[PDB]
Coordinates of N, CA and C and ligand atoms in Angstrom, one line a residue:
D6 N -14.9 18.2 22.7 CA -16.9 17.2 22.3 C -18.2 17.2 23.1
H7 N -18.3 17.3 22.5 CA -20.1 17.0 23.6 C -20.4 16.0 23.3
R8 N -20.0 13.8 22.9 CA -20.3 13.5 22.8 C -19.3 12.6 23.6
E9 N -20.1 11.2 24.5 CA -18.9 10.5 25.0 C -17.9 10.0 23.8
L10 N -17.0 8.9 25.2 CA -15.5 9.1 24.6 C -16.1 7.2 24.0
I11 N -15.3 7.0 22.6 CA -14.9 6.0 22.2 C -14.8 5.0 22.8
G12 N -14.2 3.5 22.8 CA -14.6 2.6 23.1 C -13.5 2.4 24.6
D13 N -12.2 2.4 23.8 CA -11.0 2.1 25.2 C -11.2 3.7 25.6
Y14 N -12.0 4.4 25.5 CA -12.2 6.4 26.6 C -10.9 6.4 26.6
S15 N -10.1 6.8 24.7 CA -9.2 7.0 24.8 C -9.4 8.7 24.4
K16 N -10.3 8.9 23.3 CA -10.4 10.2 22.7 C -11.7 10.3 22.7
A17 N -11.8 11.4 22.0 CA -13.3 11.7 21.6 C -13.8 10.2 20.5
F18 N -14.4 11.4 19.1 CA -14.9 10.6 18.6 C -14.0 12.0 17.7
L19 N -13.8 10.9 16.1 CA -13.5 11.8 15.1 C -14.4 13.2 14.2
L20 N -15.5 12.1 13.4 CA -16.5 11.9 12.6 C -17.7 12.5 13.4
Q21 N -18.2 14.3 12.9 CA -18.7 14.1 13.2 C -20.5 12.9 13.0
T22 N -21.6 13.3 13.4 CA -22.4 11.4 13.5 C -23.4 12.4 13.6
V23 N -24.8 11.5 12.9 CA -26.2 11.8 12.3 C -27.1 10.8 13.1
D24 N -28.2 11.5 13.6 CA -29.1 10.4 14.7 C -29.4 9.1 13.5
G25 N -29.5 7.8 14.3 CA -29.9 6.6 13.0 C -30.4 5.8 14.4
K26 N -31.6 4.6 14.4 CA -32.4 4.1 15.1 C -31.3 3.8 15.9
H27 N -30.8 3.0 16.2 CA -29.8 2.4 17.2 C -29.4 3.7 17.8
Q28 N -30.5 3.6 19.2 CA -29.2 5.1 19.5 C -28.2 5.1 20.8
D29 N -27.7 4.1 20.6 CA -25.9 3.6 21.3 C -25.1 3.4 20.8
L30 N -25.3 3.5 19.0 CA -24.2 3.3 18.4 C -23.8 4.2 17.6
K31 N -22.4 5.2 16.2 CA -23.3 6.5 16.0 C -22.5 5.6 13.7
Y32 N -23.0 6.9 13.5 CA -24.3 7.0 12.5 C -23.5 8.3 11.6
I33 N -22.7 7.7 10.5 CA -22.0 8.7 9.6 C -23.0 8.9 8.4
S34 N -22.8 10.4 7.9 CA -23.7 10.5 6.7 C -22.8 9.7 4.5
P35 N -23.3 10.1 4.6 CA -23.1 9.4 3.0 C -21.7 11.2 2.6
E36 N -21.4 11.8 2.6 CA -21.0 13.1 2.6 C -19.6 13.1 3.6
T37 N -19.7 12.0 4.7 CA -18.4 11.8 5.7 C -18.2 10.8 5.1
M38 N -18.9 9.9 5.0 CA -17.7 8.6 4.4 C -17.2 8.8 3.2
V39 N -17.6 9.6 2.2 CA -16.8 10.2 1.3 C -15.2 11.5 1.3
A40 N -15.3 11.7 2.6 CA -14.9 13.3 3.3 C -13.0 11.4 3.6
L41 N -13.4 10.1 4.6 CA -13.3 9.4 4.8 C -11.7 9.0 3.5
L42 N -12.4 8.6 2.4 CA -12.4 8.1 1.5 C -12.0 9.0 0.3
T43 N -11.5 10.0 0.8 CA -11.0 11.5 -0.2 C -10.2 11.8 0.5
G44 N -9.6 11.4 1.6 CA -8.0 11.4 2.7 C -7.8 12.6 3.6
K45 N -9.7 13.5 3.8 CA -9.7 14.3 4.3 C -9.2 14.1 5.7
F46 N -9.2 13.0 6.4 CA -9.1 13.0 7.9 C -7.6 12.3 8.1
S47 N -7.2 12.1 6.2 CA -5.4 11.5 6.7 C -4.2 11.9 8.0
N48 N -4.2 13.0 7.9 CA -3.1 13.2 8.5 C -3.7 12.3 10.3
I49 N -5.0 12.1 10.8 CA -5.1 11.4 12.0 C -5.6 9.9 11.9
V50 N -6.1 9.7 10.6 CA -7.2 8.2 10.7 C -6.0 7.7 9.5
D51 N -5.3 6.7 10.5 CA -3.9 6.2 9.7 C -5.0 4.8 8.7
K52 N -6.5 4.6 8.6 CA -6.7 3.0 8.3 C -7.7 3.1 8.8
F53 N -8.7 2.5 7.3 CA -10.0 2.9 8.2 C -10.4 1.4 7.2
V54 N -11.9 0.2 7.7 CA -12.0 -0.4 6.6 C -13.3 -0.7 6.6
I55 N -14.2 -0.5 5.3 CA -15.6 0.0 5.4 C -16.2 -1.7 5.1
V56 N -17.1 -2.2 5.8 CA -17.5 -3.5 6.2 C -18.7 -3.5 5.2
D57 N -18.3 -3.4 4.0 CA -20.5 -4.3 3.6 C -20.9 -6.0 3.7
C58 N -21.8 -5.5 4.9 CA -22.3 -6.7 5.7 C -23.3 -7.1 4.4
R59 N -23.5 -7.0 3.0 CA -24.3 -7.0 2.5 C -24.7 -9.1 2.1
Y60 N -24.6 -9.7 1.3 CA -24.5 -10.5 0.8 C -23.8 -11.0 -0.8
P61 N -23.0 -11.7 -1.1 CA -22.0 -11.4 -1.8 C -22.7 -11.4 -3.0
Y62 N -24.2 -11.4 -3.6 CA -25.0 -10.9 -4.9 C -25.3 -9.4 -5.1
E63 N -25.2 -9.0 -3.4 CA -25.3 -7.6 -3.6 C -23.8 -6.5 -4.1
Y64 N -23.0 -7.3 -2.8 CA -21.7 -6.3 -3.8 C -21.3 -6.4 -4.7
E65 N -21.3 -7.9 -4.7 CA -21.0 -8.0 -6.2 C -22.4 -6.7 -7.5
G66 N -23.4 -6.5 -7.4 CA -23.9 -5.8 -8.2 C -24.1 -4.3 -7.7
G67 N -22.8 -3.8 -6.8 CA -22.1 -2.4 -6.8 C -21.5 -2.5 -5.6
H68 N -20.4 -1.5 -5.6 CA -20.8 -2.0 -3.6 C -19.0 -1.1 -3.6
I69 N -19.3 0.4 -2.4 CA -18.2 1.5 -2.3 C -16.5 1.1 -2.1
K70 N -16.3 1.7 -3.3 CA -14.9 1.4 -3.3 C -13.6 1.3 -2.6
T71 N -12.9 -0.2 -2.0 CA -12.2 -0.3 -0.9 C -12.6 -1.5 0.0
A72 N -14.0 -1.3 -0.3 CA -14.7 -1.9 1.0 C -14.3 -3.5 0.9
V73 N -15.0 -4.2 1.9 CA -14.7 -6.1 2.3 C -16.1 -6.3 2.2
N74 N -16.2 -7.3 1.9 CA -17.6 -8.2 1.8 C -17.2 -9.4 2.9
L75 N -18.5 -9.5 4.2 CA -18.1 -9.7 5.5 C -19.4 -9.9 5.5
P76 N -20.4 -11.3 4.8 CA -21.7 -11.0 5.5 C -21.5 -11.9 7.1
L77 N -20.7 -12.6 7.1 CA -21.0 -13.7 7.8 C -20.2 -13.6 9.4
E78 N -20.3 -13.7 10.2 CA -20.2 -13.4 11.4 C -18.8 -14.0 11.9
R79 N -18.8 -15.4 11.2 CA -17.7 -15.9 11.0 C -15.9 -15.1 10.5
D80 N -16.6 -15.2 9.3 CA -15.4 -13.8 8.2 C -15.7 -13.2 8.9
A81 N -16.2 -12.7 9.5 CA -15.4 -11.0 9.6 C -15.0 -11.1 10.9
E82 N -15.3 -11.7 11.7 CA -14.6 -12.3 13.0 C -13.4 -12.2 12.2
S83 N -13.2 -13.6 11.6 CA -11.3 -13.7 11.2 C -11.1 -12.4 10.8
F84 N -11.3 -11.9 9.4 CA -10.8 -11.1 8.8 C -9.8 -9.4 9.8
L85 N -11.2 -9.7 10.9 CA -11.0 -8.2 11.5 C -10.2 -8.9 12.9
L86 N -10.5 -9.9 13.5 CA -9.7 -10.2 14.7 C -8.5 -11.6 14.8
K87 N -8.8 -12.0 13.6 CA -7.6 -12.9 13.9 C -6.0 -12.7 14.1
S88 N -5.6 -11.1 13.5 CA -4.3 -10.0 13.2 C -5.4 -9.0 12.5
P89 N -5.1 -8.4 14.0 CA -6.1 -7.2 14.1 C -5.5 -6.3 13.1
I90 N -5.9 -5.4 12.1 CA -5.4 -4.5 11.3 C -5.7 -3.5 12.6
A91 N -4.2 -2.8 12.4 CA -3.6 -1.8 13.9 C -2.7 -0.6 13.0
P92 N -3.1 0.7 13.3 CA -2.1 1.3 12.5 C -0.4 1.7 12.9
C93 N -0.3 2.2 11.5 CA 0.9 2.2 11.6 C 2.2 3.1 12.3
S94 N 1.4 4.2 13.4 CA 1.8 5.3 14.0 C 0.9 5.1 15.3
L95 N 1.8 5.2 16.2 CA 0.7 4.6 17.8 C -0.1 6.4 17.6
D96 N 0.4 7.1 17.6 CA -0.7 8.2 17.4 C -2.1 8.4 16.1
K97 N -1.9 7.1 15.3 CA -3.0 7.3 14.0 C -4.4 6.1 14.7
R98 N -5.0 6.6 13.9 CA -6.6 5.4 14.3 C -6.8 5.3 13.5
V99 N -7.6 3.8 14.0 CA -7.6 3.1 12.4 C -9.7 3.1 13.2
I100 N -10.1 3.3 11.9 CA -12.0 3.5 12.4 C -12.3 2.1 11.7
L101 N -13.3 1.8 12.0 CA -14.4 0.5 11.0 C -15.4 1.4 10.8
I102 N -16.0 0.9 9.6 CA -17.5 2.0 8.7 C -18.3 0.6 8.2
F103 N -19.4 0.7 9.4 CA -20.2 -1.0 9.2 C -21.5 0.0 7.8
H104 N -21.4 -1.5 7.3 CA -23.4 -1.3 6.4 C -24.1 -2.1 6.0
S105 N -25.7 -2.0 5.3 CA -25.6 -3.2 4.5 C -26.1 -2.1 3.6
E106 N -27.3 -2.9 3.0 CA -28.0 -2.1 2.6 C -28.9 -1.1 2.4
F107 N -29.5 -1.4 4.0 CA -29.9 0.4 4.4 C -29.5 0.4 5.5
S108 N -28.7 -0.4 6.0 CA -28.0 -0.1 6.7 C -29.6 -0.3 8.7
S109 N -29.9 -0.6 7.9 CA -31.0 -1.0 9.5 C -30.9 -1.9 9.9
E110 N -30.8 -3.6 9.3 CA -30.9 -4.8 10.4 C -29.3 -5.7 10.4
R111 N -28.3 -5.9 9.2 CA -27.3 -6.6 8.9 C -25.5 -5.7 9.4
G112 N -26.2 -4.1 9.3 CA -24.7 -3.5 9.9 C -24.4 -3.3 11.2
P113 N -26.0 -3.4 10.8 CA -26.1 -3.0 13.1 C -25.8 -4.1 13.8
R114 N -25.9 -5.1 13.7 CA -26.0 -6.3 14.4 C -24.6 -6.7 13.9
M115 N -23.4 -6.6 12.8 CA -22.4 -6.4 12.3 C -21.5 -5.6 13.6
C116 N -22.2 -5.1 13.5 CA -21.3 -4.1 14.7 C -21.1 -4.2 15.9
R117 N -22.4 -5.0 16.7 CA -22.5 -5.2 17.7 C -21.5 -6.5 17.6
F118 N -21.8 -7.5 17.2 CA -21.1 -8.1 17.2 C -19.6 -7.9 17.1
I119 N -18.9 -7.2 16.4 CA -17.4 -7.0 16.1 C -16.7 -6.4 17.6
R120 N -17.6 -5.2 18.0 CA -17.4 -5.3 19.2 C -17.6 -6.2 20.5
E121 N -18.6 -7.1 20.6 CA -19.1 -8.3 21.4 C -17.0 -9.0 22.1
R122 N -17.6 -9.6 20.6 CA -15.7 -10.0 20.1 C -14.8 -9.1 20.9
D123 N -14.4 -8.0 20.3 CA -13.7 -7.9 20.8 C -12.7 -7.2 21.8
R124 N -14.4 -7.3 23.2 CA -14.8 -7.6 24.5 C -13.9 -8.5 25.0
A125 N -14.6 -9.6 24.9 CA -13.9 -10.5 25.0 C -12.4 -10.9 24.6
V126 N -11.6 -10.7 23.6 CA -9.7 -10.5 23.7 C -9.3 -10.4 24.3
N127 N -9.9 -8.7 25.0 CA -9.0 -8.1 25.3 C -9.1 -7.7 26.8
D128 N -7.8 -6.9 26.9 CA -8.2 -6.3 28.6 C -9.2 -5.6 28.8
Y129 N -9.9 -5.5 29.9 CA -11.0 -3.7 29.6 C -10.5 -3.5 30.1
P130 N -10.6 -1.9 29.4 CA -11.2 -1.6 28.4 C -10.3 -1.0 27.5
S131 N -9.0 -1.7 27.1 CA -9.1 -2.3 25.7 C -9.0 -2.6 24.5
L132 N -9.3 -1.9 23.3 CA -10.0 -2.7 22.2 C -8.6 -2.5 21.2
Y133 N -9.1 -3.4 20.2 CA -8.8 -3.3 19.1 C -9.6 -2.2 17.8
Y134 N -11.0 -1.9 18.3 CA -11.5 -1.2 16.8 C -12.3 -0.3 18.5
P135 N -11.6 1.0 18.7 CA -13.0 1.5 19.9 C -13.9 2.2 19.4
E136 N -13.2 2.7 17.8 CA -14.2 3.4 17.3 C -15.0 3.0 16.0
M137 N -16.4 2.3 16.0 CA -16.4 2.6 14.9 C -18.3 3.4 14.7
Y138 N -18.6 2.9 13.5 CA -19.8 3.8 12.9 C -20.6 3.2 12.1
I139 N -21.9 3.5 12.0 CA -22.8 2.8 10.4 C -23.2 4.1 9.9
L140 N -23.3 4.0 8.2 CA -22.8 4.5 7.3 C -24.5 4.9 7.4
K141 N -25.0 6.1 7.7 CA -26.9 6.3 8.0 C -27.4 6.1 6.6
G142 N -28.3 5.0 6.3 CA -28.9 5.0 5.1 C -27.9 3.4 3.6
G143 N -27.1 3.0 4.7 CA -26.0 1.6 3.7 C -26.6 2.1 2.3
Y144 N -26.0 1.6 2.0 CA -25.5 1.3 0.1 C -26.3 2.3 -1.0
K145 N -28.2 1.9 -0.2 CA -28.8 2.0 -0.8 C -29.4 3.4 -0.9
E146 N -28.8 4.8 -0.1 CA -28.3 5.9 0.3 C -27.6 6.5 -0.7
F147 N -26.0 5.8 -0.2 CA -25.0 6.3 -0.7 C -24.6 6.1 -2.3
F148 N -25.5 5.0 -3.3 CA -24.8 5.6 -4.7 C -25.5 5.9 -5.2
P149 N -26.9 6.9 -5.2 CA -27.7 7.7 -5.5 C -26.8 9.1 -5.3
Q150 N -26.4 9.5 -4.3 CA -25.5 11.1 -4.0 C -24.1 10.6 -4.6
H151 N -23.4 9.6 -4.2 CA -21.8 9.1 -4.7 C -21.8 8.4 -5.6
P152 N -22.5 8.1 -7.5 CA -21.6 7.2 -7.9 C -21.0 6.3 -8.0
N153 N -19.8 8.0 -8.6 CA -18.4 7.1 -8.1 C -18.1 7.0 -7.7
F154 N -18.1 7.0 -6.1 CA -17.5 6.2 -5.5 C -17.9 4.6 -4.9
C155 N -18.7 4.4 -6.3 CA -19.3 2.6 -6.2 C -18.8 1.9 -7.5
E156 N -18.6 0.5 -7.2 CA -18.1 0.2 -8.5 C -19.0 -1.6 -8.1
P157 N -19.2 -2.2 -9.5 CA -19.8 -1.7 -10.5 C -21.4 -0.3 -10.3
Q158 N -20.9 0.9 -10.9 CA -21.6 1.7 -10.5 C -22.9 1.6 -11.0
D159 N -23.6 0.4 -10.0 CA -25.0 0.5 -9.8 C -25.8 -0.1 -8.4
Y160 N -27.0 -1.2 -8.1 CA -26.9 -1.2 -7.2 C -28.4 -2.6 -7.3
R161 N -27.7 -3.4 -6.8 CA -28.5 -5.0 -7.0 C -29.3 -5.0 -4.8
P162 N -30.5 -4.9 -5.0 CA -31.2 -4.8 -3.4 C -31.5 -6.3 -3.6
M163 N -31.5 -6.4 -2.1 CA -31.0 -7.5 -1.7 C -32.3 -8.7 -2.0
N164 N -33.9 -8.4 -2.3 CA -34.7 -8.6 -2.6 C -34.7 -8.3 -4.4
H165 N -33.5 -8.0 -5.3 CA -34.0 -8.7 -6.6 C -34.6 -8.9 -7.0
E166 N -36.0 -9.8 -8.0 CA -36.3 -11.0 -8.6 C -35.8 -11.6 -8.5
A167 N -34.6 -11.1 -9.5 CA -33.8 -12.5 -10.6 C -32.4 -12.6 -9.0
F168 N -32.6 -12.8 -7.9 CA -32.1 -13.4 -7.0 C -32.3 -13.7 -5.9
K169 N -33.0 -14.5 -6.4 CA -34.2 -15.4 -5.2 C -33.6 -16.4 -4.6
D170 N -32.5 -17.4 -5.2 CA -32.4 -18.8 -5.2 C -31.0 -18.3 -4.7
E171 N -30.3 -17.3 -5.0 CA -28.9 -16.8 -4.1 C -29.0 -15.7 -2.5
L172 N -30.5 -16.3 -2.1 CA -30.5 -15.1 -1.3 C -30.8 -16.4 -0.3
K173 N -31.4 -17.2 -0.5 CA -32.3 -18.5 -0.1 C -30.6 -19.2 0.7
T174 N -29.4 -19.2 -1.0 CA -28.5 -20.1 -0.5 C -27.9 -19.3 0.8
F175 N -27.8 -18.6 0.1 CA -26.5 -17.4 1.1 C -27.6 -17.6 2.8
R176 N -28.5 -17.7 3.2 CA -28.9 -17.9 4.4 C -28.5 -19.5 4.4
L177 N -29.3 -19.9 4.2 CA -27.8 -21.6 4.6 C -26.4 -21.6 5.1
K178 N -26.2 -20.6 4.8 CA -24.6 -20.6 5.4 C -24.5 -20.0 6.6
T179 N -25.5 -19.4 7.3 CA -26.5 -18.6 8.5 C -25.4 -19.3 9.5
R180 N -25.2 -19.0 10.7 CA -25.3 -19.8 11.4 C -26.0 -20.0 12.5
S181 N -27.7 -19.4 12.2 CA -28.7 -19.1 13.2 C -29.8 -18.0 13.1
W182 N -30.9 -18.7 12.7 CA -32.3 -17.6 12.3 C -33.1 -18.1 13.8
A183 N -34.0 -17.0 13.3 CA -35.3 -17.0 14.5 C -36.2 -18.7 14.4
Ligands
LIG201 N1 -22.3 -3.4 21.1 C1 -21.9 -2.2 20.4 C2 -21.4 -1.4 20.3 C3 -20.7 -0.9 18.9 C4 -20.0 0.7 18.6 C5 -20.3 1.4 20.0 O1 -19.7 2.6 19.7 C6 -20.9 1.4 20.8 C7 -21.7 0.4 21.3 F1 -22.4 -0.1 22.1

């Protein structure tokens, strides 16, 4: 493999990656996301979690099948790290995939946060989630490519004109803002 090792330096990244703006994070294409969902890697990948970092109204308007909605850092931390999601075989992998609407801000932010927390609760260099990816282009790019991998088959942007109140309501539940 022509890249660096995963975060606990145990092995190479399994998935092919594409360029993304956060140069130190690994991005995957919609096609690769589908390869996971269709079990192309089932001999090796025991579990993968799709972490939809968008707000609940966005998720409710259409999300990737099997995805979990964890927009608040405190909830992502509880869900992922209170009782870590472990493979059922020592030989097999657990992978996290983070995304948001464009995977420009919210997805990458959550990915970095989880790494920070994972490091904090382990003896270096061990990690619960050494292998994490960002879905390039987020839900906005995924839905038009693979609508039957989504439910409902629709797309509700964060800035949807009918959801301005819902955006504000959610923001007021966050731990920090500028
Ligand atoms: N932060 C962070 C972080 C998350 C995943 C990764 O592969 C590398 C990183 F620096």
